[PDB]
Amino acid sequence: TIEKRYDFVFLFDVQDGNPNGDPDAGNLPRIDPQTGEGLVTDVCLKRKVRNFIQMTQNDEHHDIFIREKGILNNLIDEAHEQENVKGKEKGEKTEAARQYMCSRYYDIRTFGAVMTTGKNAGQVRGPVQLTFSRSIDPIMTLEHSITRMAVTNEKRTMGRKFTVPYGLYRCHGFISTHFAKQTGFSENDLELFWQALVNMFDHDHSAARGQMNARGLYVFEHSNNLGDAPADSLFKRIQVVKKDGVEVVRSFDDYLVSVDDKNLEETKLLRKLGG
Amino acid sequence: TIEKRYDFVFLFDVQDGNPNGDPDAGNLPRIDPQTGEGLVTDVCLKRKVRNFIQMTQNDEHHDIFIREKGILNTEAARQYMCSRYYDIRTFGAVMTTGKNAGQVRGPVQLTFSRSIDPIMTLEHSITRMAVTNEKDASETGDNRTMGRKFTVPYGLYRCHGFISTHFAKQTGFSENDLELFWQALVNMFDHDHSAARGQMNARGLYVFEHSNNLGDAPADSLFKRIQVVKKDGVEVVRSFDDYLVSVDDKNLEETKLLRKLGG
Amino acid sequence: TIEKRYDFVFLFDVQDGNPNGDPDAGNLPRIDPQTGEGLVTDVCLKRKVRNFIQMTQNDEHHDIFIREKGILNNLIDEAHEQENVKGKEKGEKTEAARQYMCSRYYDIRTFGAVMTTGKNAGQVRGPVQLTFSRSIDPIMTLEHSITRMAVTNEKDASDNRTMGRKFTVPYGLYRCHGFISTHFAKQTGFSENDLELFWQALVNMFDHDHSAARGQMNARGLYVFEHSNNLGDAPADSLFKRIQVVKKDGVEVVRSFDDYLVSVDDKNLEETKLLRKLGG
Amino acid sequence: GLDRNRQDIGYVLGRLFAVLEKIQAEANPGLNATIADRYFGSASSTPIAVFGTLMRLLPHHLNKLEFEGRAVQLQWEIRQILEHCQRFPNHLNLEQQGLFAIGYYHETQFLFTKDALKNLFNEA
Amino acid sequence: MILHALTQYYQRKAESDGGIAQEGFENKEIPFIIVIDKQGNFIQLEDTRELKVKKKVGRTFLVPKGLGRSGSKSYEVSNLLWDHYGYVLAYAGEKGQEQADKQHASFTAKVNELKQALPDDAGVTAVAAFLSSAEEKSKVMQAANWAECAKVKGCNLSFRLVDEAVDLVCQSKAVREYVSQANQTQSDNAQKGICLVTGKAAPIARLHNAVKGVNAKPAPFASVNLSAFESYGKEQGFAFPIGEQAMFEYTTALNTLLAGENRFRIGDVTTVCWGAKRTPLEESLASMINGGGKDKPDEHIDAVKTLYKSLYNGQYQKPDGKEKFYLLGLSPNSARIVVRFWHETTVAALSESIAAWYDDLQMVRGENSPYPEYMPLPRLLGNLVLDGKMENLPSDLIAQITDAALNNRVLPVSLLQAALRRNKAEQKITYGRASLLKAYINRAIRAGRLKNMKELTMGLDRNRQDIGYVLGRLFAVLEKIQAEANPGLNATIADRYFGSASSTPIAVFGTLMRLLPHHLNKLEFEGRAVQLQWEIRQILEHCQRFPNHLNLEQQGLFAIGYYHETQFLFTKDALKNLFNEA
Amino acid sequence: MTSFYKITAYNSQALYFWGTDADVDRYVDWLNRDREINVYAAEAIPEAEWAQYEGRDDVLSGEECGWDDF
Amino acid sequence: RFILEISGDLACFTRSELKVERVSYPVITPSAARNILMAILWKPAIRWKVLKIEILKPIQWTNIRRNEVGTKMSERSGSLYIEDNRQQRASMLLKDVAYRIHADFDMTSEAGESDNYVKFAEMFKRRAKKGQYFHQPYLGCREFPCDFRLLEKAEDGLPLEDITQDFGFMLYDMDFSKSDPRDSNNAEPMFYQCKAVNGVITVPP
């Protein structure tokens, strides 16, 4: 049960590869169709964090609820098949089953989870809550046309491996104390989350995404669990832009990350983790 | 109680999340059909306020009674609860037993917060690396749970509201209660986050604090005094800075006070 | 299985060859249009590695699953034969298929594949993923034209005017970034032995793939940061940007590895990381 | 659609590249391969990398180019094109790069135009 | 005018030999009828269940209303004669025979009071003696026919008395006047005002008669069930006051329409369709023209021609034009029935609207196109969603889209944003989706909501200037070139850019043009290659610059342009003929 | 064993039902044909409260037709 | 004869019949107009007899579902816990409507001594031009605002010029007569929109 209320901004980069390939557009990195800015949806980082937990926690009280080969209802009923919830009647059972998972499935603790699948098991708003990342600058999906030399079936197969030459993606992630009360999102679970966000992509590499790194984790620790001031101001204090000269972004060096910690005398401790 | 009716405008934006999806239309952010202006039902703001009050005050004389299971876990009795559940007095209430057929009209009437300029929902089709049930969904070929996460790339929403002091008196809605209401309408989104809603912010709470209880000036013209519009440059909105928030407090002095709580 | 997570930069210079065609663009090397930088797709680099493994290990426990004429479905089904026909039933059949193919196909333990095409044999992410690989400095594809001294078919037979194009790169010190994922190595058993075979792959891989178009690639460097913890002791990016490759000050055209300076910094990054240099 | 005085650099370079495609295409009517087919990618991306070699190669194609007026007005086109291109960019960013391509196609409109080029040369 | 219009149509059906239920009945389907003499005792058992694709629940008999059980004290209430097996025969079915007995107990009493209130009819005497001697059928219920073993498709049996063999004792004249006067007396007992429909003082009907068909479950048209909706202490179904007689009127009118052929059920939003002067000759058609394909006739949608022929110059000229429709738009909200759209419309306005519609989605199809020449609205609205239409965004899209079609209104921007959704989602422009985008753009132009663009024409607007359209033209020419470049292809450029190419023209068009010539040389026949390049030259001649983005309207224009060019280039010689003209 | 059954799902219109427990389970299944999430759940209404939901037209019954919606 | 001009981006005069899923009356209910004119000014001495509602914007429905709750807020219960008590109510709202409600007030029997018709007339005039009110005029559903201004004769084009859609019977001022102070009970007194020629001629009882 964390106490402060956290509003962090995440700066990660996609050197070469799909940040979050849109299944609507082949594997195209999701680009905001208006801006050409890339979008690495909530769920993308969320799942990579889940992967990181899977990769570095591997125990109860920290399992993930959305695993790579997971029938959700099997987990859900595993919850329902818990004495703590077995003897509950109906409504309590729901709210108790949730408790069980929010005592085990770190993802459900950290982020949300829609547990209405089998034997219904409640919902968690999700103490942590990563909004969409956006690429600060329109990215240039590079359409990299690759060929597999071994045809898949009884038949030289064309294929695409969409990458982006570079994208500084800015997430705005939200960790509300009040929800943390109702999900038991411990301080320790939060520190695991921080280890994730700093190290998540370092631990989640794939051909389609290639080099993706965490740049900055500029966290604002709202002193009051009540928001010490609109997080909008907090994030706008983390102003990240092109260095004036560059018009074709290709590195984090092609960006500047201006933190604005001068005026935070309201004690929103600006923890610096990435940058 | 408050003595002077507060009209007000609420400038709040959706960074990249769902403002509030049509339970008609799957979950796409509410959309004015013939304009493309994003709606966000006042009801939605009212809910976020209720949530905020539940997530901040957490004490007697400040409960909600219209709470969420997901958040925290005759006129004499009517007045008891108006003093009791903050949402009773603040937004109103309807009692199973009450004078005006149960009405507890309550001060803070709000409005369907339109967008300033049409939003363009971004329907990020998303996958689940697990699947709900070991069934046709659990296809061995793949986990074709092409979940959608309809979102707005950005949208400025203009929630009018009309805290009417007479109902504050009729419900004991206090000056402190209304200060709480403003501070809620500001820090609310900060306290209300969710995968669907992404990041959502209060871009300014322009409170036309009148002076006379019955009022001071025609509300509509007042809300005209908060003219927000795209900067001429941007034909596509990507953030708050694309919008410009002009505040006309020139003839305001008549008897009003344009408190700029939000910014 | 891999003990320590590995993040490595692999500096390889095409010198007068086509490093990786772009079937999008004729056959000319993948040039990053918005920056004119050159690109060997990690599939292409990995495939040179696969080729090298075909070339050396040539046995079971090291097959390649993408052999020149291999019919992917048949290798998959052969997996669905070995002992998982009934050893596993319907759901763990796929997983045991993964485990088999990794036990046999060096490529799969190495880069994995989508094995759910035919008889679904699982998916493997690939413990040693390679970044899509870039050029430090823009390549300028020469686009050599080359004729036909004898024409293919009698129809075009009538000089011969059927000039082919042998695109090359005058030079480019293509940097690549490795990501060896211990926490995923366990998922396929890509082992330290298989790893050292991968290192010989990166060092000797171009030396064992010499085609017409590749010109004369070489593995200029293989700097590796060995994460002491399987957890990343540092983010991969700090590691990598520590390996700096620049134009030497005095040159504006690019010709050689001597043309670029390759600073292998290891001053303090060696907290628990190791920077050990197989390339040079 | 073509703009005489576009002055937007990538546009004019593509505009150049198209007129060169004209010069050599008319210079090698039998030969079907076009420098468009052979460079357009790099040309758009890296302009110098192939405008150097092409632009060297222009008068050789002019020599192959039979009708004389053909050659002199194609000179003329190059003339105002390089009026607009003050200086070959090291590279091309995207909007300018699609502009490269779109200038290509304005010129190739302008030159596959049945008669326009000689007229425009005449009052110039 | 919802309820009043329903009532109008009920009156029409009653007065026009439509044979609707006469204020006192429901056309409940009787699985089987026990044929009886003056003493019954199983004179015979006729099974009526023989029917359509499934072995149904009998012939349609306008028997007295189902008084409804509503659970707890079910056995107390019993339908007049036709009824449940446990009510009628006291057939067990299961341990729930004791209650069935009580059912029987009341049913008997019902029948008994039916005899007492209405003597001198042999039928009621017959069924009374029948109830006395149900043992004659206690064997029959397993001797002649069966109830499919729990409470299914044999349940709701009834009584017919021999010597008429066609008229049910339920629908027998004598019993009929009894039930009508009984509905009158019980009505007189209750409060008496006021109709929301006839406006006269009349018995208010609690529990509106659960119209059947919009929801899967038969559902109330308007039942203020839950406590909050209970508004002004009227407190259940008086919240709305409607004359119980008129309640019957409209609920039956709605039921018949919902079951009639007029149910062009686009996805969720079922849509009945009246005519104030009933049988305006369009009422039956209105579904066939906005639907009505059903895929079994495959031609009724092309009976829009009949409409489109009737439209003498574009505006309906037949005398039955000023007669009004109402175009109710029911839709499922699990227990209730949302009204998505009401649009009282003169058919002249409506037929004209359908004309304007099937003009506005009218988009070129290649010769021998699989797509129909006037695609049915359900199919279009299908295109706006991955597949099926339960996912289809019912009100926002289907309600308002249907409204605009049926009332010539401007299509919603919601339509465009959904359509562009599905564009970027399938990366492919079905004749369906493209037709909708054309309809929206054309109507927005004609309504000024979209400004400065000429109306889109089905035939490709070669002299179009719209950066949207003259980028769709590009993208499609590129699509053709890329296809011809690699005639065997996993998925062309369109399938992997149309989103960005529809919205972010620079970030992909730059790359696409870069690819273009490499594909262009790979053309097999360089005559075709130069033809394509000439068309692409014509295209880029109109454009001056790839925009950094596209407005939703422009994204549309892009989709329409792309589909027009894909039809153009897929046309056998069109590209060649234009090229040769140049 | 026939009961008034409340059918609830997260933020979903409550659906009241009357019939057997096997009946309500089958109706739950019908509601959950497509709902990969927000699966309607069956709850037994306490006997005393029955008269309240009784009458409410928003209830499906354990009569024959209470199963034709498939 | 006051001439108020209701205007609101979005109006909802729920049909009694389909109250459960808002069918907003095609026009404002004379009952609603009654309540708005109460909102501008209602001391219990005045009952607002609405004379002539005039349509000022063409009837433009727009549908929205508010994911609404459906149990009245009950005393004894501790909270409503919406997720249990949820009913997604659709609504065929009116969108962007203005109504020139020719209106009047009559002195109630509860007039009092200080009860000048001119008194409240002037008071309402001030409340309108000055734009005062008791509550911001709820335009059929208080969630939807109103923008009122006491026009003098005519200052907005009225759309339904020719005799337009008979909307059938609808809700008049929902009778309070059977009720004690503050509408304990009632009886909805349906009236007729007979000919919304241009402005519906609301009839007093």
Tab-separated table of C-alpha atoms in Angstrom, chain G residues 71-164:
chain	number	residue	atom	x	y	z
G	71	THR	CA	-32.298	2.693	-8.275
G	72	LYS	CA	-33.519	5.872	-6.628
G	73	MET	CA	-31.077	7.024	-3.994
G	74	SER	CA	-32.428	5.207	-0.955
G	75	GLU	CA	-31.962	6.458	2.586
G	76	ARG	CA	-31.309	3.224	4.449
G	77	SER	CA	-28.801	1.846	1.964
G	78	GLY	CA	-25.288	3.063	2.638
G	79	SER	CA	-24.345	3.739	-0.980
G	80	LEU	CA	-25.633	3.005	-4.435
G	81	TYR	CA	-22.575	1.133	-5.738
G	82	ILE	CA	-23.514	1.920	-9.317
G	83	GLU	CA	-21.775	-1.060	-10.875
G	84	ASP	CA	-24.427	-3.237	-9.308
G	85	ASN	CA	-27.303	-0.882	-10.066
G	86	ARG	CA	-26.313	0.101	-13.583
G	87	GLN	CA	-28.701	0.714	-16.474
G	88	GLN	CA	-27.165	2.071	-19.646
G	89	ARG	CA	-29.876	4.477	-20.626
G	90	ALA	CA	-29.948	5.597	-24.207
G	91	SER	CA	-31.363	8.960	-25.040
G	92	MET	CA	-32.648	10.473	-28.248
G	93	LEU	CA	-31.857	13.973	-27.085
G	94	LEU	CA	-32.667	17.153	-28.860
G	95	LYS	CA	-29.507	18.876	-29.997
G	96	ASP	CA	-28.934	22.617	-30.332
G	97	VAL	CA	-32.464	23.831	-29.737
G	98	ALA	CA	-33.934	27.204	-28.917
G	99	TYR	CA	-37.506	27.885	-27.862
G	100	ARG	CA	-39.268	31.225	-27.794
G	101	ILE	CA	-41.637	30.452	-24.916
G	102	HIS	CA	-44.248	33.129	-24.961
G	103	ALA	CA	-45.216	32.776	-21.346
G	104	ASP	CA	-46.989	34.346	-18.422
G	105	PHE	CA	-47.417	33.882	-14.714
G	106	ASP	CA	-50.596	33.921	-12.705
G	107	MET	CA	-50.815	34.762	-9.047
G	108	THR	CA	-51.442	31.672	-7.014
G	109	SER	CA	-53.883	31.538	-4.150
G	110	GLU	CA	-50.713	31.494	-2.056
G	111	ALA	CA	-50.209	35.080	-3.170
G	112	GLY	CA	-49.526	36.832	0.124
G	113	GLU	CA	-49.932	40.544	0.666
G	114	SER	CA	-46.810	41.525	-1.298
G	115	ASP	CA	-48.011	39.903	-4.489
G	116	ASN	CA	-48.153	42.513	-7.227
G	117	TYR	CA	-48.414	41.006	-10.681
G	118	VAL	CA	-46.258	43.947	-11.674
G	119	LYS	CA	-43.918	43.121	-8.799
G	120	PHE	CA	-43.066	39.646	-10.004
G	121	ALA	CA	-43.318	40.764	-13.613
G	122	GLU	CA	-40.552	43.300	-13.109
G	123	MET	CA	-38.645	40.889	-10.907
G	124	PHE	CA	-38.664	38.232	-13.618
G	125	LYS	CA	-37.786	40.816	-16.258
G	126	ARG	CA	-34.729	41.707	-14.224
G	127	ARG	CA	-33.894	38.075	-13.594
G	128	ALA	CA	-33.971	37.431	-17.318
G	129	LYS	CA	-32.132	40.409	-18.784
G	130	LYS	CA	-29.704	40.285	-15.891
G	131	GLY	CA	-29.694	36.550	-16.524
G	132	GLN	CA	-30.505	35.511	-12.978
G	133	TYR	CA	-32.217	32.281	-12.014
G	134	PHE	CA	-33.070	30.011	-9.144
G	135	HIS	CA	-31.380	27.080	-10.905
G	136	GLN	CA	-29.810	27.281	-14.326
G	137	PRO	CA	-32.856	26.451	-16.407
G	138	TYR	CA	-32.784	22.740	-16.909
G	139	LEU	CA	-33.571	22.166	-20.541
G	140	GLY	CA	-35.612	19.025	-20.076
G	141	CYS	CA	-32.904	17.389	-18.012
G	142	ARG	CA	-30.965	19.510	-15.605
G	143	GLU	CA	-27.798	17.911	-16.875
G	144	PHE	CA	-28.468	20.006	-19.856
G	145	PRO	CA	-28.110	23.735	-19.534
G	146	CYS	CA	-30.108	26.590	-20.904
G	147	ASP	CA	-29.281	29.991	-22.288
G	148	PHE	CA	-32.204	32.323	-21.737
G	149	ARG	CA	-32.723	35.964	-22.543
G	150	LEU	CA	-35.979	37.841	-22.303
G	151	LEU	CA	-36.662	38.777	-25.887
G	152	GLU	CA	-39.145	41.566	-26.433
G	153	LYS	CA	-40.914	40.590	-29.653
G	154	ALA	CA	-38.859	38.332	-31.948
G	155	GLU	CA	-35.083	37.950	-32.144
G	156	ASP	CA	-34.385	34.523	-33.670
G	157	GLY	CA	-35.544	32.851	-36.848
G	158	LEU	CA	-38.051	30.083	-36.194
G	159	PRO	CA	-37.496	26.981	-38.360
G	160	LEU	CA	-40.827	25.226	-38.548
G	161	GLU	CA	-42.373	28.044	-40.562
G	162	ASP	CA	-45.189	26.189	-42.310
G	163	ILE	CA	-47.548	23.979	-40.314
G	164	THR	CA	-45.158	21.323	-39.121
